[PDB]
């Protein structure tokens, strides 16, 4: 989801065309365009990190 969203949001044309399209873009649309890819990738990486990080161990004491 993150990869496809990033590609489709940042593959609309040249720098000027993309900048003008984003300027005409609404506030919520800009927010989603900026946040969707980052949130998806970050959630995937966090889920990956959780497994290697064994925090839920019952010996935590002292």
């Amino acid at each position: 989801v993150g990869s496809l969203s990033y590609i489709f949001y940042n593959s609309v044309g040249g720098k000027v065309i993309r900048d003008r399209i984003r300027a005409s873009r609404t506030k919520a649309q800009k927010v989603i365009v900026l946040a969707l890819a980052f949130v998806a990738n970050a959630a995937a990486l966090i889920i990956a990190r959780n497994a290697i990080t064994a925090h839920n161990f019952g010996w935590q004491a002292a």
Binding site: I7, F8, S11, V12
Partner: protein, 62 residues
């Protein structure tokens, strides 16, 4: 080299890439970057594309 300016920042660039000459067809100039990693044409969300001309003509014909 001094004249060379494929983009329109310094030397104005026509929307019609070139000026067609008599006895030749009108073809687009080959772009500087010929990468073929292009998506299918993108359209605005909820873009209206109904065949209005056909619908109107059919309605008139009845």
């Amino acid at each position: 080299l001094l004249k060379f300016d494929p983009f329109g920042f310094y030397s104005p660039k026509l929307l019609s890439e070139n000026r067609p000459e008599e006895a030749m067809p009108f073809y687009e100039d080959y772009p500087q970057n010929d990468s073929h990693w292009n998506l299918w044409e993108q359209f605005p969300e909820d873009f209206e594309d109904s065949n209005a001309e056909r619908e109107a003509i059919l309605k008139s014909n009845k």
